[PDB]
Amino acid sequence: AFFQQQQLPAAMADTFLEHLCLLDIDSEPVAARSTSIIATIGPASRSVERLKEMIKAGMNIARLNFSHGSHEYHAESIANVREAVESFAGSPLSYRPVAIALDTKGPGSGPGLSEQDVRDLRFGVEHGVDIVFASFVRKASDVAAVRAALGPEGHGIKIISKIENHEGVKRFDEILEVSDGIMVARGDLGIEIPAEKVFLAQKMMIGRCNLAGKPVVCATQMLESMITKPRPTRAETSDVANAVLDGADCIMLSGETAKGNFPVEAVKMQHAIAREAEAAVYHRQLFEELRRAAPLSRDPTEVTAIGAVEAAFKCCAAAIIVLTTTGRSAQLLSRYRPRAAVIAVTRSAQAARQVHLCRGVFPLLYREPPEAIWADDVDRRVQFGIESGKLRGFLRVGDLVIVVTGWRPGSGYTNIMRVLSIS
Amino acid sequence: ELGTAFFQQQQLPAAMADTFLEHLCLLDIDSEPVAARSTSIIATIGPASRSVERLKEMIKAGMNIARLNFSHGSHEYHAESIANVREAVESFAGSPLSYRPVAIALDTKGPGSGPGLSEQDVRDLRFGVEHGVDIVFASFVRKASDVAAVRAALGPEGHGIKIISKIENHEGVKRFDEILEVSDGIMVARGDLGIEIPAEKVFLAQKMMIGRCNLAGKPVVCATQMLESMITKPRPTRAETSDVANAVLDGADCIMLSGETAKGNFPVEAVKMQHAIAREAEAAVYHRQLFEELRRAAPLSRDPTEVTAIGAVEAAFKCCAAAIIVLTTTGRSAQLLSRYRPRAAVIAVTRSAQAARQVHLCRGVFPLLYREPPEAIWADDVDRRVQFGIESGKLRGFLRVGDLVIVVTGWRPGSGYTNIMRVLSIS
Amino acid sequence: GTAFFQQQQLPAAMADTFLEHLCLLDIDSEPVAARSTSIIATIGPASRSVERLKEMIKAGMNIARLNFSHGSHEYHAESIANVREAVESFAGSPLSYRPVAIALDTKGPGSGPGLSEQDVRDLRFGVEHGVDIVFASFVRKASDVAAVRAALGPEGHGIKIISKIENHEGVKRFDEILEVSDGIMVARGDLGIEIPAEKVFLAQKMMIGRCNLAGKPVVCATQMLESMITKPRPTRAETSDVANAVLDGADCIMLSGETAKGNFPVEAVKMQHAIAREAEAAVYHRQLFEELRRAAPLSRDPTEVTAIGAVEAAFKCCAAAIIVLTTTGRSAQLLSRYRPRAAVIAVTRSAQAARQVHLCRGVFPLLYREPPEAIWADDVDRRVQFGIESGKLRGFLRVGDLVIVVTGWRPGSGYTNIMRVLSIS
Amino acid sequence: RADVAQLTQELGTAFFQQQQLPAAMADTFLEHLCLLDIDSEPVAARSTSIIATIGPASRSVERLKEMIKAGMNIARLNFSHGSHEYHAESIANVREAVESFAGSPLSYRPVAIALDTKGPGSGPGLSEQDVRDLRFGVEHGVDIVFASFVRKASDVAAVRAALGPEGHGIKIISKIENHEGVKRFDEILEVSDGIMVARGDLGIEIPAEKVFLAQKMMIGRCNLAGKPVVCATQMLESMITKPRPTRAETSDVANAVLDGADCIMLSGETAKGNFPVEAVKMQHAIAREAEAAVYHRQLFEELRRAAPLSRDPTEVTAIGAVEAAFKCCAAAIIVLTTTGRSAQLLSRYRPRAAVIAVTRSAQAARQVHLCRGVFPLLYREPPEAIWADDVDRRVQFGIESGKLRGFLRVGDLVIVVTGWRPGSGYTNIMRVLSIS
Ligand SMILES: Nc1ccc(S(=O)(=O)N2CCN(S(=O)(=O)c3ccc(O)c(O)c3)CC2)c2nonc12
Ligand SMILES: Nc1ccc(S(=O)(=O)N2CCN(S(=O)(=O)c3ccc(O)c(O)c3)CC2)c2nonc12
Ligand SMILES: O=P(O)(O)OC[C@H]1O[C@](O)(COP(=O)(O)O)[C@@H](O)[C@@H]1O
Ligand SMILES: O=P(O)(O)OC[C@H]1O[C@](O)(COP(=O)(O)O)[C@@H](O)[C@@H]1O
Ligand SMILES: O=P(O)(O)OC[C@H]1O[C@](O)(COP(=O)(O)O)[C@@H](O)[C@@H]1O
Ligand SMILES: O=P(O)(O)OC[C@H]1O[C@](O)(COP(=O)(O)O)[C@@H](O)[C@@H]1O
Ligand SMILES: O=C([O-])C(=O)[O-]
Ligand SMILES: O=C([O-])C(=O)[O-]
Ligand SMILES: O=C([O-])C(=O)[O-]
Ligand SMILES: O=C([O-])C(=O)[O-]
Ligand SMILES: [K+]
Ligand SMILES: [K+]
Ligand SMILES: [K+]
Ligand SMILES: [K+]
Ligand SMILES: [Mg+2]
Ligand SMILES: [Mg+2]
Ligand SMILES: [Mg+2]
Ligand SMILES: [Mg+2]
């Protein structure tokens, strides 16, 4: 029965063509949904009660569109998101962190950092936002200007550059090099370049981000008809599935959740599609290609990450449990696209929110009392990942897990991979 | 010899990549498509696309197959649509070197619960035979006996009509192999399929059916809501353009328009948009792995047509051939070339007007209808048809003097004897 | 039938990986195909008798090597005459006649920088006696090949020059030597003295790989069956060396003292024949063809385009043979570079091309002697029927077999452009 | 270039010119052949073990010391010739030569002792002389038995039974010498510790032109099973009388290593020849050149694809450690082992990195020479009070011995493989350490 679920007959195929031939509508997804859902907050999704339903439906990142609304409006949206999120903190083994992302208005008619963006970026730092979706990035100096406007207090906010025009596509490599990730902003991109070429830019950018090991977001009109209708079109469900199959780390909802009549249903639909598409991923070729393309490295976190992903595939590990301070060790595991869930146990509330940008990373915020012996404290965090995993359905007694830790406290010392039997 | 500019167009840098990941990384929005669009466009005929003048614009925009939906309208209404299509098509027939055939496909109403065919389907299928339709899109096919029922209804005069089974429910998906075995091809009818099975599972059924049809070498059509928003808006959504591109990248032979052309406000623009997207997606196909996998999955064969087809496709890839010119009576030799997915256009020269319309079902097949009287010496008649394909290709932009073409012929007249592949330099 | 798929290592041929291919190799799976790696036998006191040369031709000798390091011009002219007499004794039956090439192996430059005066005299002797191939000793650079070419003069333009790589400089300047040569000989004897003995296998494997990539003949030579000079059976290392030279990709394998002076010249030829046949069936064509296709650049030459189409068609139907019409041997060489499992039966009117194509693996030359028919299409057809009748008599073909036929659109060399699928009746 | 660019800037272009690294990074096997370079020097320690047959030419203690220094890892006693008194003296001389370098782990080289049986002859099962010779082996503490003419699984069971309850630790390597042994190979391999391709008898029992097919098939199946395979007979035959081998002989040794053999053997070359030490030096020189020419890119991918999924943590850790070693070009994989099993599971994936096996078992240290790329280190210190400290001391012993022996250098990355509790069978940890 195990080998009939999660498209495992299609996963064992020797060619991609045979993999397609073996895809089965009756093979149910079992693994937890890996691709994060970004939902835009607006009039249709601002209330605390609505936000609680959206968190339960699968929203991982709340997007604030600073093209509309005042700072007072956005501060209220932030407070409502935090209130809805913290209402589930009473059960620490099932609490779900939710990131807050600020989407800038943009440079507009000018080719420089606007005065409104400088004010909005400062608002973001003061309100503790986790991510900035920087609009209309056309070159590396645009990313540097956003970074500078965040100042010294905003040093830890992730900058996701939105590629929205021909220049951004042509200067992609230099933009990606200085960004934390990319958003394929298809709305403006489809007006700036011929509509029939947007899919080439999406596929190229997803491929280059996967190669770089940096998050990529697919955005705009994914479930557009759901703004007024309860069910999406056949093109819309295929678009969501294909963004996941292309290699996108995150999928986004704009008007569907910000102003539409069915915000919760749009989140549920993206969750349902992503789960089905993730099981249909051809890991046999994907992992070998990512493994071949990632350069040789002498960084122990990089070396441990490939060893752990290889070990997970060998035993069909239910999960890879990793301890992380900044999220980096979890991101390096994520870049190889394991079928095994990457359960990231962290003390940092910000890192727990930010790792939603990386596909297959399930953040757990550790809030248990400390152990006096560091080695005992490490083991306790590892057991916490196992208990949360058991409660959430990721793990069962008898499962094998890969555990990734470091040799000394502090960030940057991951170097150990262990094979653990559950209970 | 070819120039550096040649290797920058039609995603040739991405085509040379050693891995699919590197192929994605090398896709370029500035690399322009050069080859003729190979995925056929099926447009549904209705009030918005019925007039002769509107049909002429749709033919110019790229419509290859006209679909008549027998769920609506009387036999008198459909006979008028057929006559208007034929009048618009024949208005360009004055130039045999330029003439574009257009197939006519009848889409049945369906069984609507009950064994065998409905009485309305028997009557509509008989109308199709009497009006010389090329294809039947058979609704709600659930098993092999449903196809046998459609085949029996095609009377004594309609055995040459192609039956494309529409898979619209869970049973059709589960009994897919037995349905494909007895059908000429398949339509992934996503509208009903999305109501019969969970909406989030339709993409798995589409990808599986396209894969199995590609492996079997049989035509597969992707249908319903591909450019839905274009029924009222002049431009499609980002999800819609991606859906068309991904149907082509999945391996679909045909793409379809329903309400977009039958009742919408922008029928010609919907055809133009599908044409524009398909051209871009076809150049982005990763032929290196696709050909290798079709080659590996296809079993060994002692059929000379099948053996010649793989030799010709391999030869076309070796020289970047502008085209593969094939002589065919039934369309079979062109279909066997098509199954290996050559980048080269397959120019099919035929004397059969029906085979010229029906080969639009096979991706990359460009039919040319040959109307010259037969030569007394067969070898001369073969050479005259080969030169007709070269001169049509020159007129239409496929070929230039100095280009290499692959020519596929047989050793004697009649269908079933294809066994020769020649490499010709265009003079 | 099921029996067909149990022979010629076909279960190992279908394997998805090289490791699974090794695991499926079967000592009970008998070789069926004709032996495709040519055997070069050195002529000497043990193999100069016309009657003994007839036995070596029957055992499988394809090329007779004359080592100009020993013997006078008078001695070598006698070797040539005895070889030709033994070869021509089978000309009375044209359907089974086997051409045999004559190769002149030069003495070398010695302490000198360029072509020695003895080499200039020996090369002129070769042209005057109509030799087919020159194995040029101690080639160190492209100018050494040009000097050999110049010494052959205007009448020796058709002689093939196979450069012997025998020292470190020849290995380092390999690419420039291969570019101007017709092929290469891995002359392991001198190479093993010039460079450390434990490195010779790297130079052999590299040179075979680069020659296979270039589509040019490569000969593996020296001490392949050395112990058979005095013993009737070779050592386990010797049989493995022959098998591995074939698996590496060598077009030809050579015998030196084993046939020139040993007590078992005919048996040494039979042993090389037996091993090569076994090794050729064990070749992993699935990866080999894929890699040769991938490494070969795009081409606008119709002979080259037809060749890959014909090899792909032959693999699709398990063709028993690819029958090709050739004047210079080039169309057969372009088929050979893709390493088809199907035998390449080359029909030619050129006696020299029939001898020279033995340098290309899997090419079986047939010398056609009939004067041209008035209708060119009938002349082409009579040659293809000759290839079929020769193949049927020799065991290559049976009724019901599929064959790929490669021809051109007009008479003369350089116009191959047609591939046809034929059923043997 | 982008997949090696940063590592090329760090380690330098000279690093990437040695050990056939340009041929190693080729995308196809054809390009790998084209890039093989006679000027690319081998850097890694020789990983294929050399088995040398002991006889009149190689029996003296002083000669055995030179053979150990030249590279002999396993001493073979051929029980087809000589009395029990002769063989006991050969064993004592081997042990004396081996123990003469025992003052430090930087000079110590464990050498296994293998007993090669006379065989069944015309009889169906185990002969009475074999029963007596096998009991002699147990009484004299031999590490391995090369069982002659194994034709079926019951033949190996009979050898195992003749070793008795005290010889359960002895490894049984079945010699495949005839057609029946080849046809019943799978059942023989299943119950054996490894296989010897005994080409001498095999070449008389089956056509000589078919021996290479049997050798290649058996090596491939042993590699797939993860069990040792020995290539034997006439590898450097002419070196019995000549100081240099023939071109066929050097190619045969190189090709046995490229086929996947764990061990290569010398018979008359060391037992009775005029150049026993030179024969060992020649096999050592060829094996190092051939090991660097192995195409690890496809070999690792295929071993990975053919190996089934596993829930054994030692097996799961082994593939993770080999993958980690390839990622950083690790100088070594240091593994703690009691029976040798954890080192054998690393060895089956054919890492380019040396597998340094730290053990307290003198027998396991001798027996791991059967597995390609395993370098045994015999740990002699008494156990620490705290088990975790004892483990750490053994790992540091491997690092310090590795540095002083040239295997490791400052700045190198090493992969360390250990378990979660004492005792055999609990390996489950892989660590990445930087050498300081
Ligand atoms: N890095 C990556 C590796 C592998 C994949 S993949 O999903 O396995 N991938 C699907 C597309 N191709 S294809 O050549 O177009 C093809 C399409 C259809 C066919 O029938 C066929 O035979 C080949 C095969 C490979 C990735 N997807 O995103 N990133 C990927
Ligand atoms: N288990 C094993 C796995 C992989 C290898 S390998 O070294 O990577 N390798 C061997 C040679 N072959 S080939 O198909 O004969 C070939 C030969 C020549 C060619 O030019 C070519 O393109 C292909 C390619 C694969 C092994 N070698 O011994 N055991 C091996
Ligand atoms: O992914 P990051 O940011 O490098 O964090 C990984 C770090 O987490 C740990 O596993 C545990 O460290 P702490 O005890 O400081 O939480 C370290 O050993 C390791 O260096
Ligand atoms: O694709 P089909 O229907 O088999 O037709 C291919 C046939 O066309 C030809 O090339 C030309 O035949 P005709 O002269 O009868 O048209 C035949 O030699 C070949 O058998
Ligand atoms: O291999 P080559 O030397 O190019 O010879 C091939 C030539 O042989 C032919 O098949 C037959 O030519 P001939 O009639 O002159 O012998 C030509 O059509 C073709 O050009
Ligand atoms: O390779 P083997 O025989 O399984 O030995 C591996 C064992 O060695 C260890 O690393 C150390 O164990 P000991 O302390 O008993 O020597 C164990 O944790 C592990 O189970
Ligand atoms: O701003 C956006 O998200 C866009 O343009 O797609
Ligand atoms: O009938 C159709 O085309 C459908 O249901 O999609
Ligand atoms: O000359 C030769 O043939 C040699 O040196 O091997
Ligand atoms: O016994 C042996 O070693 C042999 O026969 O090779
Ligand atoms: K915005
Ligand atoms: K209908
Ligand atoms: K000479
Ligand atoms: K013995
Ligand atoms: Mg925008
Ligand atoms: Mg329907
Ligand atoms: Mg020489
Ligand atoms: Mg023996």
mmCIF file with all atom_site columns, N, CA, C and O and ligand atoms in Angstrom, chain C residues 18-19 22 212 247-248 284 287-288 291, chain D residues 29-30 33 258-259 295 298-299 302, ligand 2:
data_model
loop_
_atom_site.group_PDB
_atom_site.id
_atom_site.type_symbol
_atom_site.label_atom_id
_atom_site.label_alt_id
_atom_site.label_comp_id
_atom_site.label_asym_id
_atom_site.label_entity_id
_atom_site.label_seq_id
_atom_site.pdbx_PDB_ins_code
_atom_site.Cartn_x
_atom_site.Cartn_y
_atom_site.Cartn_z
_atom_site.occupancy
_atom_site.B_iso_or_equiv
_atom_site.pdbx_formal_charge
_atom_site.auth_seq_id
_atom_site.auth_comp_id
_atom_site.auth_asym_id
_atom_site.auth_atom_id
_atom_site.pdbx_PDB_model_num
ATOM   1   N N   . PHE C 1 18  ? 25.719 0.058  -17.414 1.00 0.00 ? 18  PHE C N   1
ATOM   2   C CA  . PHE C 1 18  ? 26.903 -0.729 -17.740 1.00 0.00 ? 18  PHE C CA  1
ATOM   3   C C   . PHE C 1 18  ? 27.121 -1.821 -16.690 1.00 0.00 ? 18  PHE C C   1
ATOM   4   O O   . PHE C 1 18  ? 27.492 -2.929 -17.044 1.00 0.00 ? 18  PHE C O   1
ATOM   5   N N   . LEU C 1 19  ? 26.832 -1.541 -15.408 1.00 0.00 ? 19  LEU C N   1
ATOM   6   C CA  . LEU C 1 19  ? 26.978 -2.522 -14.330 1.00 0.00 ? 19  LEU C CA  1
ATOM   7   C C   . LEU C 1 19  ? 26.029 -3.712 -14.561 1.00 0.00 ? 19  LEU C C   1
ATOM   8   O O   . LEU C 1 19  ? 26.452 -4.856 -14.461 1.00 0.00 ? 19  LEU C O   1
ATOM   9   N N   . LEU C 1 22  ? 27.372 -5.841 -17.429 1.00 0.00 ? 22  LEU C N   1
ATOM   10  C CA  . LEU C 1 22  ? 28.407 -6.781 -16.987 1.00 0.00 ? 22  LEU C CA  1
ATOM   11  C C   . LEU C 1 22  ? 27.780 -7.995 -16.326 1.00 0.00 ? 22  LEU C C   1
ATOM   12  O O   . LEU C 1 22  ? 28.138 -9.127 -16.647 1.00 0.00 ? 22  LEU C O   1
ATOM   13  N N   . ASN C 1 212 ? 38.449 7.138  -32.121 1.00 0.00 ? 212 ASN C N   1
ATOM   14  C CA  . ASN C 1 212 ? 37.028 6.810  -32.251 1.00 0.00 ? 212 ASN C CA  1
ATOM   15  C C   . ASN C 1 212 ? 36.214 8.098  -32.415 1.00 0.00 ? 212 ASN C C   1
ATOM   16  O O   . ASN C 1 212 ? 35.318 8.161  -33.259 1.00 0.00 ? 212 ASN C O   1
ATOM   17  N N   . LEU C 1 247 ? 37.242 -4.040 -26.694 1.00 0.00 ? 247 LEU C N   1
ATOM   18  C CA  . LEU C 1 247 ? 36.314 -3.298 -25.849 1.00 0.00 ? 247 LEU C CA  1
ATOM   19  C C   . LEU C 1 247 ? 36.706 -1.813 -25.712 1.00 0.00 ? 247 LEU C C   1
ATOM   20  O O   . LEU C 1 247 ? 35.828 -0.982 -25.562 1.00 0.00 ? 247 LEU C O   1
ATOM   21  N N   . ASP C 1 248 ? 38.009 -1.470 -25.799 1.00 0.00 ? 248 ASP C N   1
ATOM   22  C CA  . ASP C 1 248 ? 38.478 -0.083 -25.738 1.00 0.00 ? 248 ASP C CA  1
ATOM   23  C C   . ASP C 1 248 ? 37.979 0.701  -26.981 1.00 0.00 ? 248 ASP C C   1
ATOM   24  O O   . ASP C 1 248 ? 37.750 1.914  -26.889 1.00 0.00 ? 248 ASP C O   1
ATOM   25  N N   . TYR C 1 284 ? 28.918 -2.697 -25.321 1.00 0.00 ? 284 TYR C N   1
ATOM   26  C CA  . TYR C 1 284 ? 27.680 -2.110 -24.834 1.00 0.00 ? 284 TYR C CA  1
ATOM   27  C C   . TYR C 1 284 ? 27.244 -1.006 -25.808 1.00 0.00 ? 284 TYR C C   1
ATOM   28  O O   . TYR C 1 284 ? 27.475 0.172  -25.556 1.00 0.00 ? 284 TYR C O   1
ATOM   29  N N   . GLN C 1 287 ? 25.253 2.527  -24.814 1.00 0.00 ? 287 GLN C N   1
ATOM   30  C CA  . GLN C 1 287 ? 25.971 3.729  -24.426 1.00 0.00 ? 287 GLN C CA  1
ATOM   31  C C   . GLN C 1 287 ? 26.964 4.173  -25.491 1.00 0.00 ? 287 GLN C C   1
ATOM   32  O O   . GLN C 1 287 ? 27.127 5.370  -25.722 1.00 0.00 ? 287 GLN C O   1
ATOM   33  N N   . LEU C 1 288 ? 27.652 3.215  -26.128 1.00 0.00 ? 288 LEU C N   1
ATOM   34  C CA  . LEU C 1 288 ? 28.627 3.544  -27.177 1.00 0.00 ? 288 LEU C CA  1
ATOM   35  C C   . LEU C 1 288 ? 28.014 4.359  -28.333 1.00 0.00 ? 288 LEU C C   1
ATOM   36  O O   . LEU C 1 288 ? 28.543 5.405  -28.670 1.00 0.00 ? 288 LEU C O   1
ATOM   37  N N   . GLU C 1 291 ? 26.977 7.909  -27.120 1.00 0.00 ? 291 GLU C N   1
ATOM   38  C CA  . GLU C 1 291 ? 28.132 8.776  -26.953 1.00 0.00 ? 291 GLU C CA  1
ATOM   39  C C   . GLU C 1 291 ? 28.784 9.173  -28.251 1.00 0.00 ? 291 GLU C C   1
ATOM   40  O O   . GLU C 1 291 ? 29.237 10.310 -28.355 1.00 0.00 ? 291 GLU C O   1
ATOM   41  N N   . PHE D 2 29  ? 31.874 8.861  -21.020 1.00 0.00 ? 29  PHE D N   1
ATOM   42  C CA  . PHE D 2 29  ? 32.990 7.920  -20.921 1.00 0.00 ? 29  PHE D CA  1
ATOM   43  C C   . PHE D 2 29  ? 33.977 8.136  -22.085 1.00 0.00 ? 29  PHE D C   1
ATOM   44  O O   . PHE D 2 29  ? 35.190 8.048  -21.880 1.00 0.00 ? 29  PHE D O   1
ATOM   45  N N   . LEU D 2 30  ? 33.471 8.482  -23.284 1.00 0.00 ? 30  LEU D N   1
ATOM   46  C CA  . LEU D 2 30  ? 34.309 8.736  -24.448 1.00 0.00 ? 30  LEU D CA  1
ATOM   47  C C   . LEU D 2 30  ? 35.217 9.939  -24.188 1.00 0.00 ? 30  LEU D C   1
ATOM   48  O O   . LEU D 2 30  ? 36.420 9.855  -24.446 1.00 0.00 ? 30  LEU D O   1
ATOM   49  N N   . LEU D 2 33  ? 37.971 8.938  -21.708 1.00 0.00 ? 33  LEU D N   1
ATOM   50  C CA  . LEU D 2 33  ? 39.099 8.286  -22.370 1.00 0.00 ? 33  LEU D CA  1
ATOM   51  C C   . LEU D 2 33  ? 39.997 9.316  -23.040 1.00 0.00 ? 33  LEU D C   1
ATOM   52  O O   . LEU D 2 33  ? 41.210 9.291  -22.834 1.00 0.00 ? 33  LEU D O   1
ATOM   53  N N   . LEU D 2 258 ? 40.295 -1.703 -13.460 1.00 0.00 ? 258 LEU D N   1
ATOM   54  C CA  . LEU D 2 258 ? 39.208 -0.975 -14.116 1.00 0.00 ? 258 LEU D CA  1
ATOM   55  C C   . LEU D 2 258 ? 37.908 -1.785 -14.177 1.00 0.00 ? 258 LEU D C   1
ATOM   56  O O   . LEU D 2 258 ? 36.838 -1.198 -14.166 1.00 0.00 ? 258 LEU D O   1
ATOM   57  N N   . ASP D 2 259 ? 37.983 -3.112 -14.227 1.00 0.00 ? 259 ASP D N   1
ATOM   58  C CA  . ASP D 2 259 ? 36.802 -3.994 -14.212 1.00 0.00 ? 259 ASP D CA  1
ATOM   59  C C   . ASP D 2 259 ? 36.081 -3.883 -12.867 1.00 0.00 ? 259 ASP D C   1
ATOM   60  O O   . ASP D 2 259 ? 34.860 -4.022 -12.840 1.00 0.00 ? 259 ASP D O   1
ATOM   61  N N   . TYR D 2 295 ? 36.395 5.799  -13.819 1.00 0.00 ? 295 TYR D N   1
ATOM   62  C CA  . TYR D 2 295 ? 35.436 6.851  -14.118 1.00 0.00 ? 295 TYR D CA  1
ATOM   63  C C   . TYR D 2 295 ? 34.381 6.850  -12.995 1.00 0.00 ? 295 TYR D C   1
ATOM   64  O O   . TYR D 2 295 ? 33.292 6.286  -13.169 1.00 0.00 ? 295 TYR D O   1
ATOM   65  N N   . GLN D 2 298 ? 30.359 7.811  -13.433 1.00 0.00 ? 298 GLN D N   1
ATOM   66  C CA  . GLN D 2 298 ? 29.372 6.822  -13.827 1.00 0.00 ? 298 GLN D CA  1
ATOM   67  C C   . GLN D 2 298 ? 29.346 5.645  -12.874 1.00 0.00 ? 298 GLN D C   1
ATOM   68  O O   . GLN D 2 298 ? 28.286 5.112  -12.603 1.00 0.00 ? 298 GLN D O   1
ATOM   69  N N   . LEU D 2 299 ? 30.505 5.201  -12.400 1.00 0.00 ? 299 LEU D N   1
ATOM   70  C CA  . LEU D 2 299 ? 30.589 4.071  -11.463 1.00 0.00 ? 299 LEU D CA  1
ATOM   71  C C   . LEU D 2 299 ? 29.747 4.311  -10.183 1.00 0.00 ? 299 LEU D C   1
ATOM   72  O O   . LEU D 2 299 ? 28.923 3.471  -9.842  1.00 0.00 ? 299 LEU D O   1
ATOM   73  N N   . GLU D 2 302 ? 25.952 4.404  -11.008 1.00 0.00 ? 302 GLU D N   1
ATOM   74  C CA  . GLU D 2 302 ? 25.435 3.068  -11.268 1.00 0.00 ? 302 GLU D CA  1
ATOM   75  C C   . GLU D 2 302 ? 25.381 2.195  -10.037 1.00 0.00 ? 302 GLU D C   1
ATOM   76  O O   . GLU D 2 302 ? 24.457 1.403  -9.930  1.00 0.00 ? 302 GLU D O   1
HETATM 77  N N1  . LIG E 3 .   ? 30.392 -1.154 -12.972 1.00 0.00 ? 2   LIG E N1  1
HETATM 78  C C1  . LIG E 3 .   ? 30.894 -0.254 -13.865 1.00 0.00 ? 2   LIG E C1  1
HETATM 79  C C2  . LIG E 3 .   ? 30.223 0.936  -14.203 1.00 0.00 ? 2   LIG E C2  1
HETATM 80  C C3  . LIG E 3 .   ? 30.780 1.866  -15.072 1.00 0.00 ? 2   LIG E C3  1
HETATM 81  C C4  . LIG E 3 .   ? 32.032 1.633  -15.629 1.00 0.00 ? 2   LIG E C4  1
HETATM 82  S S1  . LIG E 3 .   ? 32.729 2.871  -16.701 1.00 0.00 ? 2   LIG E S1  1
HETATM 83  O O1  . LIG E 3 .   ? 34.146 2.799  -16.557 1.00 0.00 ? 2   LIG E O1  1
HETATM 84  O O2  . LIG E 3 .   ? 32.059 4.110  -16.470 1.00 0.00 ? 2   LIG E O2  1
HETATM 85  N N2  . LIG E 3 .   ? 32.398 2.439  -18.241 1.00 0.00 ? 2   LIG E N2  1
HETATM 86  C C5  . LIG E 3 .   ? 33.044 1.229  -18.796 1.00 0.00 ? 2   LIG E C5  1
HETATM 87  C C6  . LIG E 3 .   ? 33.090 1.336  -20.323 1.00 0.00 ? 2   LIG E C6  1
HETATM 88  N N3  . LIG E 3 .   ? 31.724 1.569  -20.837 1.00 0.00 ? 2   LIG E N3  1
HETATM 89  S S2  . LIG E 3 .   ? 31.354 1.080  -22.359 1.00 0.00 ? 2   LIG E S2  1
HETATM 90  O O3  . LIG E 3 .   ? 29.940 1.190  -22.499 1.00 0.00 ? 2   LIG E O3  1
HETATM 91  O O4  . LIG E 3 .   ? 31.995 -0.187 -22.542 1.00 0.00 ? 2   LIG E O4  1
HETATM 92  C C7  . LIG E 3 .   ? 32.071 2.223  -23.480 1.00 0.00 ? 2   LIG E C7  1
HETATM 93  C C8  . LIG E 3 .   ? 33.325 1.968  -24.020 1.00 0.00 ? 2   LIG E C8  1
HETATM 94  C C9  . LIG E 3 .   ? 33.893 2.892  -24.878 1.00 0.00 ? 2   LIG E C9  1
HETATM 95  C C10 . LIG E 3 .   ? 33.222 4.070  -25.182 1.00 0.00 ? 2   LIG E C10 1
HETATM 96  O O5  . LIG E 3 .   ? 33.825 4.993  -25.976 1.00 0.00 ? 2   LIG E O5  1
HETATM 97  C C11 . LIG E 3 .   ? 31.945 4.302  -24.641 1.00 0.00 ? 2   LIG E C11 1
HETATM 98  O O6  . LIG E 3 .   ? 31.244 5.432  -24.902 1.00 0.00 ? 2   LIG E O6  1
HETATM 99  C C12 . LIG E 3 .   ? 31.367 3.373  -23.797 1.00 0.00 ? 2   LIG E C12 1
HETATM 100 C C13 . LIG E 3 .   ? 31.115 2.798  -20.294 1.00 0.00 ? 2   LIG E C13 1
HETATM 101 C C14 . LIG E 3 .   ? 31.039 2.674  -18.773 1.00 0.00 ? 2   LIG E C14 1
HETATM 102 C C15 . LIG E 3 .   ? 32.732 0.453  -15.331 1.00 0.00 ? 2   LIG E C15 1
HETATM 103 N N4  . LIG E 3 .   ? 33.900 -0.083 -15.752 1.00 0.00 ? 2   LIG E N4  1
HETATM 104 O O7  . LIG E 3 .   ? 33.992 -1.303 -15.146 1.00 0.00 ? 2   LIG E O7  1
HETATM 105 N N5  . LIG E 3 .   ? 32.933 -1.540 -14.352 1.00 0.00 ? 2   LIG E N5  1
HETATM 106 C C16 . LIG E 3 .   ? 32.144 -0.476 -14.451 1.00 0.00 ? 2   LIG E C16 1
#
